[PDB]
Amino acid sequence: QSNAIWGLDRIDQRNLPLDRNYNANFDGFGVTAYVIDTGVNNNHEEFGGRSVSGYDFVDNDADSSDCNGHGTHVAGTIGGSQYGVAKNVNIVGVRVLSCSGSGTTSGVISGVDWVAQNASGPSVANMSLGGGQSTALDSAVQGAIQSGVSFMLAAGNSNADACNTSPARVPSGVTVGSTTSSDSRSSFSNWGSCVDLFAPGSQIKSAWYDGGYKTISGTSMATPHVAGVAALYLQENNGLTPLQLTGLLNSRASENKVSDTRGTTNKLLYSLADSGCEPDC
Numbered sequence: 223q224s225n226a227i228w229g230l231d232r233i234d235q236r237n238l239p240l241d242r243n244y245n246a247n248f249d250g251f252g253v254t255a256y257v258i259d260t261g262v263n264n265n266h267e268e269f270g271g272r273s274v275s276g277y278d279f280v281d282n283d284a285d286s287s288d289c290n291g292h293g294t295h296v297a298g299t300i301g302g303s304q305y306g307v308a309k310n311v312n313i314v315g316v317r318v319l320s321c322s323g324s325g326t327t328s329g330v331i332s333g334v335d336w337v338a339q340n341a342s343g344p345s346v347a348n349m350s351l352g353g354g355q356s357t358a359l360d361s362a363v364q365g366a367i368q369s370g371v372s373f374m375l376a377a378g379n380s381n382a383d384a385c386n387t388s389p390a391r392v393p394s395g396v397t398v399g400s401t402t403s404s405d406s407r408s409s410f411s412n413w414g415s416c417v418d419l420f421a422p423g424s425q426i427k428s429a430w431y432d433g434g435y436k437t438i439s440g441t442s443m444a445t446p447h448v449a450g451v452a453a454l455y456l457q458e459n460n461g462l463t464p465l466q467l468t469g470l471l472n473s474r475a476s477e478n479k480v481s482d483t484r485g486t487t488n489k490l491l492y493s494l495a496d497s498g499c500e501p502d503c
């Protein structure tokens with residue numbers, strides 16, 4: 223609410239300066255976010271029971287507990303009570319990355335397919351992960367999106383063209399670059415024609431796998447801001463197809479706020495239900 227951390231603070235307003243407030247009209251009630259990552263600590267206090275295990279494709283078991291931190295931190299930015307965007311969203315852990323944060327292409331695909339097969343009501347998927355170009359992984363993500371589930375994808379952190387990263391480059395995904403609280407593109411953020419918009423990703427505080435908290439930076443942290451907002455939009459309109467949700471993320475985004483976009487469309491995440499063309503529509 224107040225004393226809001228900067229990422230949340232930024233996404234409910236058009237312009238700087240920050241006002242230390244995160245205002246919301248929705249909270250993700252009745253929506254489920256599938257976190258395809260290192261797992262999620264279901265017992266973390268930030269979730270208040272709204273997190274449950276999905277499946278663990280690293281160890282082939284039913285317990286998607288997190289032994290790295292990244293997955294929990296991402297889930298916290300989507301749905302944590304203090305530090306999340308959509309404070310009553312449901313969270314499901316889809317563990318495809320090991321305690322060290324490594325995974326296999328085929329294990330990630332299994333997680334993607336699992337979300338397509340198991341999503342029930344209004345759903346969004348978060349993939350804060352990426353590696354080399356893979357047509358097989360691209361095809362699985364494209365398939366899950368055709369199934370009706372929107373996918374938020376990290377652009378990557380190499381200060382490079384996101385189009386050379388899978389799954390970031392999948393056109394029908396919503397691919398997210400990272401900014402700081404000064405509205406600069408984060409210096410590590412990938413960039414380019416495959417990036418759909420920017421969101422807060424530098425110095426983001428959220429839940430950690432040990433039950434405490436951690437502040438970290440990456441396009442991996444920007445992405446769940448966007449998934450969080452997708453959950454807000456899905457609560458507002460349960461029936462949005464991925465094409466409709468993409469359209470709305472675009473039309474509602476704040477325009478021309480970001481510096482050093484380096485060939486990326488100048489759109490920054492906005493969490494509220496009104497259109498960002500409003501200078502000149």
Ligand SMILES: [Ca+2]
Nearest residue numbers: 231235241243
């Ligand atoms: Ca604010």
Ligand SMILES: [Ca+2]
Nearest residue numbers: 278283285286
């Ligand atoms: Ca496990």
Ligand SMILES: [Ca+2]
Nearest residue numbers: 393395396418
């Ligand atoms: Ca896209």
